[PDB]
Design a protein around this ligand. Sequence first.
Ligand SMILES: Cc1ncc(C)n2nc(CCc3nc(N4CC[C@@H](F)C4)nn3C)nc12
Ligand SMILES: [Mg+2]
Ligand SMILES: [Zn+2]
Length: 313
Amino acid sequence: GLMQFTLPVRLCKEIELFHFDIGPFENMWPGIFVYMVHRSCGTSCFELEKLCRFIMSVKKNYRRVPYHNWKHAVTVAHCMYAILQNNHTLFTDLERKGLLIACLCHDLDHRGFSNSYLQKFDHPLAALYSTSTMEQHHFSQTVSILQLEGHNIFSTLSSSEYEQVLEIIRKAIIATDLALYFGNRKQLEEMYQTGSLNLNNQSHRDRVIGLMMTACDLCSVTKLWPVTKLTANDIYAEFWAEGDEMKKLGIQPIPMMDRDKKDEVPQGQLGFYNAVAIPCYTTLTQILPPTEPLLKACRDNLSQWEKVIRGEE
Ligand SMILES: Cc1ncc(C)n2nc(CCc3nc(N4CC[C@@H](F)C4)nn3C)nc12
Ligand SMILES: [Mg+2]
Ligand SMILES: [Zn+2]
């Protein structure tokens, strides 16, 4: 009850910044997550014993894949923490509760393959979930873990607050399907420019939380350049393995997943920053001005990829 998680001084200060890297010590990640729940939500939000059991079962249900792993989950939850702490008064107690959980859970049981590869392989998940295949799976794994004995961190909520939090988590997880982001961001851009954007409209908040989810999920592009560049290596290690698997099915992968296009990576990152990342953090900064450091760090990393192309790095 009188028990506070604390961090060494460098971590206690840097965890508050958007560009924080959670580090290579796996055994500190649970503590880092509880620290963030306690400060964004309160020591009162969850029973510590239930929360600890939930976190450890979530970790066990992430796989040892190069990118979509337990480190990615905690990284995406820290970006959410930074958004919530810089926009204190914009969010309900249930949103604060749900969104860090949604972030920790958003890629549960990922196998390192895209929705498109499950559909071409004809994986059973592709017949159970026709669109947002993995993202419906991640939400289904989150519910499974919440129903294990001693793992219901939400047991203090009413039937209706419980139904609301699971609905916030479901939408937040579904929104991490990047196929859905493009249309979400265009609707948000238009609503903001014509001044129709209204945070009392539930379906507007839903879209804003959707964009916050894309922003957290993409947050590797908002780190210090060596973090950005080394994470890119993990991202391609997956994509290229998927490319190999496409060739095994007799299918030319897209360029992004073809390891023979290794040399064009600097240019693929440019398209990605211009087509996806920069527009994501721009719209986010218009709607939530204190998230600007994410846009500023993304722009810095774009000009680092530009330098790689010019042969200056
Ligand atoms: C940093 C980051 N965070 C999240 C995600 C989902 N992604 N996806 C990419 C891939 C970006 C990309 N690379 C390529 N190619 C073309 C052939 C070669 F040049 C590589 N095309 N594209 C679009 N990087 C990220
Ligand atoms: Mg995902
Ligand atoms: Zn993710």
